[PDB]
């Protein structure tokens, strides 16, 4: 149950929530869901010069099946 | 290869690079391991800013611990 072993969901500038999902092995998988469209900035405000996006990971579950789950969020910027 | 399903590794405020990790006696023999590009995060100016850090997002995977991508953390709520 991911929270219990990692803070990042809360300390990220693109913070995310975790949704319970049941079924299968593993029986319970936690999906990540960005809290915001914007990213939270150096003050704690929602900044719309960037966006929160899920980082997806293809994990193999159970014959064999590969499905895509959001592992957490990152912040993307138009500037480079 | 993620690199060509998703673009984010490049456009993130905490951009990352990927590393091939091939193991013959292992399925899936190929896993792509992410590694943050910087200690800091890219800011609005496009510079590395050390008021925040790029950190790897770790995941348990059925085949071990894998770095899937990076997010940016601040010391403030």
């Amino acid at each position: 149950n991911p929270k219990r072993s990692s803070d990042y969901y809360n300390r990220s500038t693109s913070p995310w929530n975790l949704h319970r999902n049941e079924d299968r092995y593993p029986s319970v998988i936690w999906e990540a869901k960005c809290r915001h469209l914007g990213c939270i900035n150096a003050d704690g405000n929602v900044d719309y010069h960037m966006n929160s996006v899920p980082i997806q990971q293809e994990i193999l579950v159970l014959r064999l099946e590969k499905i895509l789950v959001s592992v957490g969020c990152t912040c993307v910027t138009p500037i480079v | 290869n993620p690199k060509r399903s998703s673009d984010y590794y490049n456009r993130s405020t905490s951009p990352w690079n990927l590393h091939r990790n091939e193991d013959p006696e292992r399925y899936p023999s190929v896993i792509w391991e992410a590694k943050c590009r910087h200690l800091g995060c890219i800011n609005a100016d496009g510079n590395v800013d050390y008021h925040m850090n790029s950190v790897p997002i770790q995941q348990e995977i059925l085949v071990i611990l894998v770095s899937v991508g990076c997010t940016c953390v601040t010391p403030i709520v």
Partner: antibody, heavy 118, light 110 residues
């Protein structure tokens, strides 16, 4: 090179229904927010709709809210626009566009003509 | 909210012309401003994105700035050329809506 090829435009009656497509190439599709923007002949640009990369967020201009549906098929690099209950003022060249982040479009397609007339 | 720009703007070759874009509500400085060029019969082309960003292929004569206090954005063209004649649109957004300005026609005199 980023390329956006729109199709589906054509003649529909008022009240009628019509679906646009945008085949995308040149870039990593599902990591991009996408929008549709329209232009009546001899008049200005007008934002219609927008969608997030995942397709989880969906946005609409007030003049199309409820009549139009945007969606995307990420496994096909295709963006759609379902247009229902069409009106004469919906007559425009419809452009498909890549976003970067919500609200900052970087690339445009070449457009597809939609004519609403009896 | 709405975005106001002038209908036309006129200047002669080699000089500097500035096209302004005024936001009627919300803070301009909270949302990036884009500029597009459109030549008769053509897709819009990007001139400026995210305030000042110039894509490769666009001359450095083109530049964008923002003025947070006046709640407006401007596009500057220096070293004006005949080939610069076209329609220009600013564009910006809020957490939900995306909005275009009404477009300026750029005329090169003489």
């Amino acid at each position: 090179e980023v390329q956006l090829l729109e199709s589906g435009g054509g003649l529909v009656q008022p009240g009628g229904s019509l679906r646009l497509s945008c085949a995308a190439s040149g870039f990593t599709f599902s990591s991009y927010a996408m929008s549709w923007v329209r232009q009546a002949p001899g008049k200005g640009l007008e934002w219609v709709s927008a969608i997030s990369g995942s397709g989880g967020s969906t946005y609409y201009a007030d003049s199309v809210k409820g009549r139009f549906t945007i969606s995307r098929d990420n496994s096909k690099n295709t963006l759609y626009l379902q247009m229902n209950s069409l009106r004469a003022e919906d007559t425009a060249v419809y452009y498909c566009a890549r976003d970067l982040i919500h609200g900052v479009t970087r690339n445009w397609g070449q457009g597809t003509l939609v004519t609403v007339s009896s | 909210f709405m975005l106001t720009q002038p209908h036309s703007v006129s200047e002669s070759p080699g000089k500097t012309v500035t096209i302004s874009c005024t936001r009627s509500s919300g803070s301009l400085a909270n949302y990036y401003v884009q500029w597009y060029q459109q030549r008769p019969g053509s897709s819009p082309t990007i001139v400026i994105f995210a305030n000042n960003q110039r894509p490769s292929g666009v001359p450095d004569r083109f530049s964008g700035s923002i003025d947070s206090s006046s709640n407006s954005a401007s596009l500057t063209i220096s070293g004006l050329k005949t080939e610069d004649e076209a329609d220009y649109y600013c564009q910006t957004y809020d957490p939900y809506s995306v909005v275009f300005g009404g477009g300026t026609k750029l005329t090169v005199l003489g």
